[PDB]
Amino acid sequence: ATFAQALQSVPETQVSILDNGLRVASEQSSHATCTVGVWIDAGSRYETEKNNGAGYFLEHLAFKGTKNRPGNALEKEVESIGAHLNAYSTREHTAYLIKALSKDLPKVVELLADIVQNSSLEDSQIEKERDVILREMQENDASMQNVVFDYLHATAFQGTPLAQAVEGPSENVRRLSRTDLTDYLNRHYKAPRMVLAAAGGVEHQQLLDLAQKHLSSVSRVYEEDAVPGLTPCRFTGSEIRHRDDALPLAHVAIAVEGPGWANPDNVTLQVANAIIGHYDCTYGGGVHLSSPLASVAVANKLCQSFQTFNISYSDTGLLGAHFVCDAMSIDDMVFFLQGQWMRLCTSATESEVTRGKNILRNALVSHLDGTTPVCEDIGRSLLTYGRRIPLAEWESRIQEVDAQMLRDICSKYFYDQCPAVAGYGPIEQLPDYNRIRSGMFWLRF
Amino acid sequence: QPQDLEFTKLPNGLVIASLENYAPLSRIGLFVKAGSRYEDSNNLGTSHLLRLASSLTTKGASSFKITRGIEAVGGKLSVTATRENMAYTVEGIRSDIEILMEFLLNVTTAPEFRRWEVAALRSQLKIDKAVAFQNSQTRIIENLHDVAYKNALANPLYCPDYRMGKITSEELHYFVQNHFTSARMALVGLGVSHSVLKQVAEQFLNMRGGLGLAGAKAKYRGGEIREQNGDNLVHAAIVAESAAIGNAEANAFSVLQHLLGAGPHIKRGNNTTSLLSQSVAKGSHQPFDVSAFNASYSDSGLFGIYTISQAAAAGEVINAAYNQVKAVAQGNLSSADVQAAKNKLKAGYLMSVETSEGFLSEIGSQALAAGSYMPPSTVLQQIDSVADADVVKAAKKFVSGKKSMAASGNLGHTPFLDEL
Amino acid sequence: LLSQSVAKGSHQPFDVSAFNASYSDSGLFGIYTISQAAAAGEVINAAYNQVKAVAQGNLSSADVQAAKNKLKAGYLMSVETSEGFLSEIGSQALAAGSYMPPSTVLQQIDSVADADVVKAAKKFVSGKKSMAASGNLGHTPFLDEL
Amino acid sequence: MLSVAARSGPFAPVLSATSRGVAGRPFLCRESLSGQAAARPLVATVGLNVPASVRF
Amino acid sequence: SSKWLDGFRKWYYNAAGFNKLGLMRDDTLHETEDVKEAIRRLPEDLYNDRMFRIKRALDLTMRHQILPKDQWTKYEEDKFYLEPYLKEVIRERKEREEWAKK
């Protein structure tokens, strides 16, 4: 079997609509495990500034309390099965995962029904998890990658709800009560914005019957005919620089607005991200590394790492790279990274295109190996793309990318467009924004 | 379309294995039984340089050729360093399995180990250790294995501070020429059929036949290394000798490990009905993180209690956790909690099973430990055959065994082996 | 006796001494062996068997008198330098608060006899031990192996 | 007797440190701490183009 | 025969005259990027022996005399020590430019 026959022999995604606007989706495979999950289209975009950290508060608070099984009875019923319970939230989509065995899914789907619409919010639990969220937001400042991405989300989008981080500010989480949280739950945890997800050992008739039995009859109608609507967030090309010289390593991230979710430009710029490449100091490739910015980076020892990102939200994207370097090598890293971006936008070779195509193809199948990122992409694709895009169709839109199309779409999005520049270290050898914008266009063109 | 896991032994002493998942990602893992436990005090820390030497110049393929070949085909080459056994895994695109498989074969069976590339990799050893030791827990586990064994498992998995600048190409060639043997290692494959794997095993793999040094039985020592770090959280771990992999007590010790609790099941939850996080939180209002710790090897395992706490109340969490294991050593336990422990262990084994990297690691570990594959349904049967008195006997063996302790942080109230 | 009973079995260069360090509450007595990495197990076990021979009592009273004269002469080496004399009466006036004469110290060392040496060797060989080691450790013996 | 050099002869410079002054993430939460312990032993992964991961 | 060519190579050795100033065949090479990337690869005794021979050639060319006839380096005593490193460096750079061509 080749790649096309292997992706045709990948088992299909079954998606059905329930009676209350719910989406239920399964990928049947031969694993003995099953991950059920619920993905809700609710995050930091769909809340206003009065209730900032309500998504983080509800993803903390949906597990410790339930109207049906109060207190630690969820922990009793979960650890009597062996399920794990991840709960990740982004700026647009939040989730509640589970990870259990395939014989326990009548208990498991009932428990995930009891989590998302029957979560009682006790006020002592509200006060204790308020202290938990303030201590977690104190402990999150030492990790630099999340606060540098939060600084870039603050400085790229201004006056629009992608500025608000998923943690929420300290005043705006100490000013959260029971009635605002159940207003956010009664307005944003709705079954048209909800998809249940399964990844193996699962019959879709079992999911349809069980989600009809337990996790149906969920809302579907807003209260005062107050329907939220999605708005395009205004990308402001700006900069932010939190100079703290006592931290030993500078974390600087440069991004430019990218396509958003539903465009076919996304496969092209993630191909361009594969050509630009990722690095950390534990990478054993050395000087012979195929990424050109990585080979000059370990040739002159400039950075400790760079991660390139295509963070796409609905209608908008951030698209750039987060490098951690020392204090002396920042200007050389901005020069080599904007030179590699401008080389990819100006003169990209077909060998680089097939290298980035193979790296993106390997990363797309290596993400969709496991059952929990199969559930993550089935819930995220059922919320964003409108269906789970099969990996043969991602394979096809990877396969249509060549050097001229990659250079044209890169020259549309990267070439002479205003960056958003964030940094939280020794930020003295960062060039100023006119020098960054002067590096954003080539005089050699 | 997943018909069977083909599993056969070449007559030199090699285990070859392959599974046809009709998988678009092909993962071939070589599994040598040369971890960090098979060296001695003269060749300390050369397993770290052999772990970092995946991209050096080989015979028939250069370092530039192997880096551009692996990340231009598209897949990854990476290692996995358990203290017993090492793994060279390669994932990649199914259309060009052969170049990746001969690339990992040229990594393993015919290296060159040039002196200038080892001198370039000497700084990468220090950089990799200084990044990997930002986790506080791996220093505690390294000090734990340094304390709790006499020789041939007490060697650290990462390199020591002095051997960077001392590991030679003759030392790496001696380690490879002794302990990378076709009669010792195994080669397992996921998504790749048996025919080209047997052809590659006949082609470039069946040369070595001398098994080398087999270790020195890993005699138990017991004691304390108690360093100070300056963090507010002390990290302490109290561990006794338990049974080995393949015995009739390692399954009972793993049922006891999931009975005392070792996993954050509900994330940002209390971890309630685990017994250690029950009995610590009955007495302590301090923030903590208490868990069980099972480290099973082929010679003698290690079962213990892991405590992370604030340094003002380390004695309360450590004595409450050890009093919980002293309570369960007297038989004070419920069979519903033993059934929940058994279901948590069956869930954890299927968590190890469900990813193909984890399935490759499980097939390689079963191939090196046994030589014949054991199915996961029989693993569920062997976990379900653990009696309720066997984990009481395991906690009695943990209590009556000689202790070992590794701790770091502010050590003002951290208790000792006399107090435990 | 440590150097004789190590050098009767070892031929490599070494240095075996015994050191005492008595503080105000508790003290340490022990054997400090500097060896090569190959013969250090034979060095440490031969030294420990020599202190076992002292603990069973294989002693010569002329050698005990030579030890008494060595201690009296070494205390006079500590006395005879003015910074050492200042350190001696600084530690005496600091800990004890009274200054014994050095002749009274010589009378105490002459008052120490053989049975106290046998009792202290039995106390050292029967007490709980602690071992600090540094070097190539492939033949260094453990405390349970002693 | 009661001294530092009178107890041990050659060991006075190594138990008496002279000094001629002139020329002659912190995990702060219990719920955030769940996962920092050791379930499974030391496993080290060093890749070619993937970063370091420790399986516990 | 080949003895006329060997006599011509010996005559070219004595006419080039870097056997006069204590040097072997590979101490007189132009240290470019390839010769520098090959000059890092030697063991420490051969590297210090090459640098001592280079310093004695620099010293005696500064003093403008030569070594005597016994202290000259013969053709049979010449060792091509840099060649198994320089052939590897040249072949590695040829493979690198082949991958730059691809």
Same CATH fold assignment for domains A3-215 and A238-439:
yes
DSSP secondary structure string for all residues of B259-284: HH--S--BTTS---SSHHHHHHHTT-
Q: Return d(Cα A379, Cα A373) in angstroms, integer.
A: 9
Q: Which residues of E touch B64 (CB under 8 A)?
A: 92, 95-96, 99
- Residues 270-289 on B with a CB inside 8 Å of A are 270-274
Quick check: B64 and E41 CB within 8 A? Answer: no
Length of chain D: 56
- List the one residue out of B245, B241, B376, B346 whose CA is nearest residue B298: B245
Distance CA E31, CA E23 (A): 15
Q: State the residue range of the domain holding E77.
A: 1-102
> How far is C-alpha A349 from the chain's CA centre?
30
Q: How many CA within 13 A on the CB side of residue A87?
A: 25
List, edge to edge, every strand of the sheet that includes D43-45: B5-10, B14-19, B186-190, B25-32, B86-93, B76-82, D43-45, D53-54
Q: Which of A277, A307, A320 has its CA nearest to residue B72?
A: A277
Q: How far apart are CA B308 and CA B139, in angstroms?
A: 13
B66, with CB counted inside 10 A (0-12, 13-18, 19+), is: buried
Domain ranges of chain A: 3-215, 238-439
Does A249 lie at the interface with B, CB-CB under 8 angstroms? no
Element (H, E) at B25: strand B25-32
How crowded is residue B110: how many other Cβ atoms within 10 Å of its Cβ? 14
Cα dist. E62→A288, E19, E65, E73 in Å?
42, 16, 8, 19
Amino acid letter for position A202: V
What CATH number does domain A3-215 carry, 3.40.50.300, 3.20.20.30, 3.30.830.10, 3.40.47.10?
A: 3.30.830.10
Measure B41 CA to nearest chain C CA, in Å: 5
Residue A83 burial (C-beta neighbours within 10 Å; 0-12, 13-18, 19+): buried
| DSSP sequence for B164-197 | TTT--HHHHHHHHHHH--TTT-EEEEES--HHHH
Minimal C-alpha gap between C37 and chain D (Å): 23
Spell out which residues of chain B touch residue E40, defining contact as CB-CB under 8 Å.
116
* D15: nearest CA partner in chain C: C21
Token digits of residue B338: 């033993």
Give me the active site residues of A, please: 59
Run of H or E including B14: strand B14-19
B 353-392: CB under 8 A from A? 353-357, 376
Q: Is A3 on the interface with B (CB under 8 A)?
A: yes
CB neighbour class for B120 (10 Å; exposed up to 12, middle 13-18, buried from 19): middle
Q: Delimit the domains of chain B by residue range.
A: 1-216, 217-420
- Is residue B239 within 8 angstroms of chain D, CB to CB? no
Q: Nearest C-alpha of chain A: how many angstroms from B44?
A: 21
Do A439 and A335 touch, CB atoms closer than 8 A? Answer: yes
Q: Which chains touch B (3 or more CB pairs under 8 A)?
A: A, C, D, E
List, in sequence order, every residue forming a beta bridge with A322; answer none if it has no partner.
A253, A307
Place of tokens 């100490």: A174
Residue D2 Cα, gap to closest chain C Cα (Å): 5
Write the residue in D2, D9, D15 that is nearest to C74 by C-beta. D9
Contact B22, A9 (CB under 8 A): yes
Concatenated DSSP letters of A360-377? HHHHHHHHSSSHHHHHHH
Beta bridge partners of B93: B25
> How far apart are the C-alpha atoms of E45 and E53, rounded to whole Å?
12
**Residue B7 · residue B373 · CB < 8 Å:** yes
User: Half-sphere exposure of residue C107, counting CA atoms within 13 Å on the CB side?
Assistant: 5
User: Chains E/D: 3 or more C-beta pairs closer than 8 A?
Assistant: no
Nearest chain B residue to E40 by CA distance is: B116
The answer, yes or no, to whether A and C have at least 3 beta-carbon pairs within 8 Å is no
DSSP symbol at B150: S
Beta bridge partners of C30: C19
- Check chain D for breaks (C–N over 2.5 Å) and list the residue before each, or none: 24
Closest in A3, A32, A80 to B343, CB measured: A80
d(CA A165, CA A155): 11
User: Chains A, B: CB contacts under 8 A, how many?
Assistant: 162
Interchain pair A82, B22: CB under 8 A: no
Question: In chain A, what residues touch B266 (CB-CB under 8 Å)?
Answer: 63, 74-75, 78, 84-85
SS (H, E, C) chain E: CCHHHHHHHHHHHHHHCCCCCCCCCCCCCCCCHHHHHHHCCCCHHHHHHHHHHHHHHHHHHHCCCCCCCCCCCCCCCCCCCCHHHHHHHHHHHHHHHHHHHC
Q: Give the type of residue at C109.
A: I
Identify whether the C-beta of residue B238 lies closer than 8 Å to the C-beta of residue B419: no
Task: Give the whole-angstrom CA distance, residue B176 versus residue B178.
Answer: 5
Angle at which helix C82-91 crosses helix C61-80, to 10 degrees, equals: 100
Q: Are residues A99 and B128, on separate chains, in Cβ contact within 8 Å? A: no
Inter-chain contact C142–B221, Cβ cutoff 8 Å? yes
C-beta separation of B1 from B363 below 8 A:
no
- Taking contacts as CB-CB distances below 8 angstroms, the residues of chain A near D47 are 282-284
The residues pairing with A164 across neighbouring beta strands, listed in sequence order, are none
- B115 neighbourhood in chain E, CB within 8 Å: 41, 43
Task: Say yes or no: E41 contacts chain B, CB-CB below 8 A.
Answer: yes
- Whether residue B78 contacts residue B359, with contact meaning beta carbons closer than 8 Å, is answered with no
Is B59 part of the contact surface with chain A (CB cutoff 8 Å)?
A: no
* CB-based contact B96:A358 (threshold 8 Å): no
Interface test with B, best of C137, C139, C146 (most B CBs within 10 A): C137
Contacts of E41 in chain B (CB under 8 A): 114-116
Q: Any idea how long chain B is? A: 420
The resolution of the experimental structure, rounded to one decimal in Å, is: 3.7
Distance CA A345, CA A214 (A): 52
The residues of D whose Cβ lies within 8 A of any Cβ of C are 1-11, 15
Paired tokens of A70: 């109060």
Question: B68 CB near a chain E CB, below 8 Å?
Answer: yes
- The experimental method behind these coordinates is cryo-EM
Closest partner residue to D8 (CB to CB) among C21, C95, C96 is C21
Place of tokens 């691809």: E102
The answer to whether the beta carbons of residues A272 and A344 sit under 8 Å apart is yes
Total structural domains within chain E = 1
B contact test, residue of C129, C143, C144 with most B CBs within 10 A = C144
Contact B57, B117 (CB under 8 A): yes
Q: Give SS3 for A397.
A: helix
**Which CATH fold topology does A238-439 show?**
Cytochrome Bc1 Complex; Chain A, domain 1 (3.30.830)
Give C47 to chain D, closest Cα distance, Å: 19
**D48 and C60 in contact (C-beta within 8 Å)?**
no
